[PDB]
Amino acid sequence: VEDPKDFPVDLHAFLSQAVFSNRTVASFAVYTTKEKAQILYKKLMEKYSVTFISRHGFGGHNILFFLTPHRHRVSAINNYCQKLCTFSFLICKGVNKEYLFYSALCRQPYAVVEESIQGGLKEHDLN
């Protein structure tokens, strides 16, 4: 009932709303439970050989942010993520603003719980 219908409003700027689009992208964000995000963190690594992935706390919920070496459809990533939820909510969107989205997720009200590279992203890695 009180499950979020979208990402927090302060992150909407960094996100594509075209969840059914045909355009393949390489930057993704997932909003779900801490339970489901803890699971997807590793499963996405082995599914999409992600170049970077980071997990970010927000109250009880989590935001996963990841980059893939090949482009994918957002609907494809979401479909995979939806398999590993059942009754848990899950919001999956393409990220149009990679290092800035990430930096918002590294500051209040968010916090980085874990990430696949020590020190996380450097802005020069994306540029």
PDB file of C-alpha atoms in Angstrom:
ATOM      1  CA  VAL A   1       0.000   0.000   0.000  1.00  0.00           C
ATOM      2  CA  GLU A   2       2.545   2.630   1.213  1.00  0.00           C
ATOM      3  CA  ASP A   3       5.188   1.094  -1.157  1.00  0.00           C
ATOM      4  CA  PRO A   4       6.940   3.767  -3.244  1.00  0.00           C
ATOM      5  CA  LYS A   5       5.529   4.226  -6.786  1.00  0.00           C
ATOM      6  CA  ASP A   6       8.746   5.934  -8.038  1.00  0.00           C
ATOM      7  CA  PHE A   7      12.284   6.963  -6.947  1.00  0.00           C
ATOM      8  CA  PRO A   8      12.481   9.773  -4.366  1.00  0.00           C
ATOM      9  CA  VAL A   9      11.539  13.143  -5.945  1.00  0.00           C
ATOM     10  CA  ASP A  10      15.071  14.582  -5.383  1.00  0.00           C
ATOM     11  CA  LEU A  11      16.544  11.985  -7.768  1.00  0.00           C
ATOM     12  CA  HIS A  12      13.938  12.432 -10.589  1.00  0.00           C
ATOM     13  CA  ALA A  13      16.264  14.914 -12.349  1.00  0.00           C
ATOM     14  CA  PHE A  14      18.911  12.203 -12.969  1.00  0.00           C
ATOM     15  CA  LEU A  15      16.472   9.554 -14.338  1.00  0.00           C
ATOM     16  CA  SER A  16      14.721   8.564 -17.554  1.00  0.00           C
ATOM     17  CA  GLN A  17      10.934   8.104 -17.289  1.00  0.00           C
ATOM     18  CA  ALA A  18      10.724   6.093 -20.569  1.00  0.00           C
ATOM     19  CA  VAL A  19      10.733   2.659 -18.904  1.00  0.00           C
ATOM     20  CA  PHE A  20       9.333   0.994 -22.095  1.00  0.00           C
ATOM     21  CA  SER A  21      11.801   2.713 -24.502  1.00  0.00           C
ATOM     22  CA  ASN A  22      13.755   0.867 -27.229  1.00  0.00           C
ATOM     23  CA  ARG A  23      16.941   2.886 -26.637  1.00  0.00           C
ATOM     24  CA  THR A  24      19.647   0.796 -25.067  1.00  0.00           C
ATOM     25  CA  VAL A  25      21.669   2.423 -22.286  1.00  0.00           C
ATOM     26  CA  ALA A  26      24.577   1.539 -19.960  1.00  0.00           C
ATOM     27  CA  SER A  27      23.587   3.340 -16.689  1.00  0.00           C
ATOM     28  CA  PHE A  28      20.930   1.941 -14.376  1.00  0.00           C
ATOM     29  CA  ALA A  29      19.283   2.639 -11.031  1.00  0.00           C
ATOM     30  CA  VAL A  30      17.103   0.308  -8.940  1.00  0.00           C
ATOM     31  CA  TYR A  31      14.960   1.342  -5.932  1.00  0.00           C
ATOM     32  CA  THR A  32      13.680  -1.486  -3.718  1.00  0.00           C
ATOM     33  CA  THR A  33      14.003  -3.040  -0.213  1.00  0.00           C
ATOM     34  CA  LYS A  34      17.370  -3.439   1.506  1.00  0.00           C
ATOM     35  CA  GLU A  35      16.654  -7.209   1.356  1.00  0.00           C
ATOM     36  CA  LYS A  36      16.111  -7.255  -2.403  1.00  0.00           C
ATOM     37  CA  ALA A  37      18.982  -4.756  -3.049  1.00  0.00           C
ATOM     38  CA  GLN A  38      21.460  -6.829  -1.059  1.00  0.00           C
ATOM     39  CA  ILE A  39      20.508  -9.743  -3.356  1.00  0.00           C
ATOM     40  CA  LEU A  40      20.588  -7.875  -6.655  1.00  0.00           C
ATOM     41  CA  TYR A  41      23.997  -6.308  -5.865  1.00  0.00           C
ATOM     42  CA  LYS A  42      25.812  -9.604  -6.535  1.00  0.00           C
ATOM     43  CA  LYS A  43      23.353 -11.158  -8.978  1.00  0.00           C
ATOM     44  CA  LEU A  44      23.644  -8.120 -11.283  1.00  0.00           C
ATOM     45  CA  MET A  45      27.459  -8.377 -11.150  1.00  0.00           C
ATOM     46  CA  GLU A  46      27.331 -11.947 -12.503  1.00  0.00           C
ATOM     47  CA  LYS A  47      24.446 -11.193 -14.945  1.00  0.00           C
ATOM     48  CA  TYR A  48      25.739  -8.007 -16.625  1.00  0.00           C
ATOM     49  CA  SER A  49      29.447  -8.095 -15.721  1.00  0.00           C
ATOM     50  CA  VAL A  50      28.937  -4.556 -14.376  1.00  0.00           C
ATOM     51  CA  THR A  51      31.901  -2.166 -14.515  1.00  0.00           C
ATOM     52  CA  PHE A  52      30.734  -0.406 -11.362  1.00  0.00           C
ATOM     53  CA  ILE A  53      27.951  -1.103  -8.893  1.00  0.00           C
ATOM     54  CA  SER A  54      27.104   0.687  -5.650  1.00  0.00           C
ATOM     55  CA  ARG A  55      24.429   0.216  -3.001  1.00  0.00           C
ATOM     56  CA  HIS A  56      22.973   3.198  -1.170  1.00  0.00           C
ATOM     57  CA  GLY A  57      20.782   3.400   1.948  1.00  0.00           C
ATOM     58  CA  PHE A  58      17.610   5.513   2.220  1.00  0.00           C
ATOM     59  CA  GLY A  59      15.629   4.800   5.417  1.00  0.00           C
ATOM     60  CA  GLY A  60      14.704   1.113   5.120  1.00  0.00           C
ATOM     61  CA  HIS A  61      15.120   1.114   1.362  1.00  0.00           C
ATOM     62  CA  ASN A  62      18.077   0.830  -0.985  1.00  0.00           C
ATOM     63  CA  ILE A  63      19.145   2.351  -4.290  1.00  0.00           C
ATOM     64  CA  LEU A  64      21.453   0.339  -6.545  1.00  0.00           C
ATOM     65  CA  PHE A  65      23.350   2.270  -9.158  1.00  0.00           C
ATOM     66  CA  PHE A  66      25.377   0.452 -11.797  1.00  0.00           C
ATOM     67  CA  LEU A  67      27.131   0.762 -15.118  1.00  0.00           C
ATOM     68  CA  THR A  68      27.285  -2.012 -17.698  1.00  0.00           C
ATOM     69  CA  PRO A  69      29.999  -2.573 -20.361  1.00  0.00           C
ATOM     70  CA  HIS A  70      27.383  -3.249 -23.069  1.00  0.00           C
ATOM     71  CA  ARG A  71      24.149  -1.267 -23.483  1.00  0.00           C
ATOM     72  CA  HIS A  72      20.837  -2.859 -22.480  1.00  0.00           C
ATOM     73  CA  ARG A  73      17.141  -1.963 -22.592  1.00  0.00           C
ATOM     74  CA  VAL A  74      15.781  -0.715 -19.241  1.00  0.00           C
ATOM     75  CA  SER A  75      12.837  -3.099 -19.631  1.00  0.00           C
ATOM     76  CA  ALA A  76      15.356  -5.992 -19.809  1.00  0.00           C
ATOM     77  CA  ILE A  77      17.184  -5.016 -16.613  1.00  0.00           C
ATOM     78  CA  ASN A  78      13.843  -4.458 -14.897  1.00  0.00           C
ATOM     79  CA  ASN A  79      12.474  -7.813 -16.035  1.00  0.00           C
ATOM     80  CA  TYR A  80      15.486  -9.543 -14.538  1.00  0.00           C
ATOM     81  CA  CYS A  81      15.094  -7.591 -11.306  1.00  0.00           C
ATOM     82  CA  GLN A  82      11.342  -8.331 -11.138  1.00  0.00           C
ATOM     83  CA  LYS A  83      12.107 -12.055 -11.145  1.00  0.00           C
ATOM     84  CA  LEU A  84      14.004 -11.758  -7.841  1.00  0.00           C
ATOM     85  CA  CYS A  85      11.162  -9.784  -6.169  1.00  0.00           C
ATOM     86  CA  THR A  86       7.746 -11.222  -5.526  1.00  0.00           C
ATOM     87  CA  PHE A  87       5.750  -8.947  -3.209  1.00  0.00           C
ATOM     88  CA  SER A  88       8.595  -6.427  -2.786  1.00  0.00           C
ATOM     89  CA  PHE A  89       8.300  -3.220  -4.765  1.00  0.00           C
ATOM     90  CA  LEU A  90      10.997  -2.478  -7.318  1.00  0.00           C
ATOM     91  CA  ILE A  91      11.527   0.622  -9.452  1.00  0.00           C
ATOM     92  CA  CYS A  92      14.039   0.364 -12.311  1.00  0.00           C
ATOM     93  CA  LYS A  93      15.089   3.304 -14.475  1.00  0.00           C
ATOM     94  CA  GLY A  94      17.837   4.450 -16.800  1.00  0.00           C
ATOM     95  CA  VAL A  95      20.240   6.999 -15.397  1.00  0.00           C
ATOM     96  CA  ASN A  96      20.914  10.029 -17.621  1.00  0.00           C
ATOM     97  CA  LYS A  97      23.400  11.707 -15.239  1.00  0.00           C
ATOM     98  CA  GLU A  98      25.928   9.154 -13.992  1.00  0.00           C
ATOM     99  CA  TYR A  99      28.583  10.754 -11.663  1.00  0.00           C
ATOM    100  CA  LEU A 100      26.105  13.425 -10.383  1.00  0.00           C
ATOM    101  CA  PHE A 101      23.342  10.873  -9.547  1.00  0.00           C
ATOM    102  CA  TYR A 102      26.074   8.866  -7.795  1.00  0.00           C
ATOM    103  CA  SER A 103      27.322  11.920  -5.887  1.00  0.00           C
ATOM    104  CA  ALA A 104      23.745  12.750  -4.677  1.00  0.00           C
ATOM    105  CA  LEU A 105      23.547   9.129  -3.499  1.00  0.00           C
ATOM    106  CA  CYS A 106      26.864   9.602  -1.611  1.00  0.00           C
ATOM    107  CA  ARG A 107      25.426  12.497   0.462  1.00  0.00           C
ATOM    108  CA  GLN A 108      22.501  13.112   2.802  1.00  0.00           C
ATOM    109  CA  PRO A 109      19.820  11.960   2.856  1.00  0.00           C
ATOM    110  CA  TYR A 110      21.613   8.961   1.262  1.00  0.00           C
ATOM    111  CA  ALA A 111      24.618   6.906   2.292  1.00  0.00           C
ATOM    112  CA  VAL A 112      26.811   4.377   0.453  1.00  0.00           C
ATOM    113  CA  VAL A 113      26.531   0.941   2.100  1.00  0.00           C
ATOM    114  CA  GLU A 114      28.842  -0.821  -0.374  1.00  0.00           C
ATOM    115  CA  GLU A 115      30.325  -0.483  -3.827  1.00  0.00           C
ATOM    116  CA  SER A 116      32.327  -2.662  -6.215  1.00  0.00           C
ATOM    117  CA  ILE A 117      35.440  -0.391  -6.327  1.00  0.00           C
ATOM    118  CA  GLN A 118      37.347   0.863  -3.256  1.00  0.00           C
ATOM    119  CA  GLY A 119      36.810   4.652  -3.182  1.00  0.00           C
ATOM    120  CA  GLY A 120      33.881   4.274  -5.599  1.00  0.00           C
ATOM    121  CA  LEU A 121      33.735   6.246  -8.843  1.00  0.00           C
ATOM    122  CA  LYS A 122      36.138   8.973  -9.806  1.00  0.00           C
ATOM    123  CA  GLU A 123      34.651  11.625 -12.144  1.00  0.00           C
ATOM    124  CA  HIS A 124      37.556  11.084 -14.574  1.00  0.00           C
ATOM    125  CA  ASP A 125      36.500   7.401 -15.079  1.00  0.00           C
ATOM    126  CA  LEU A 126      33.204   8.641 -16.686  1.00  0.00           C
ATOM    127  CA  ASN A 127      34.081  12.173 -17.878  1.00  0.00           C
TER     128      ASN A 127
END
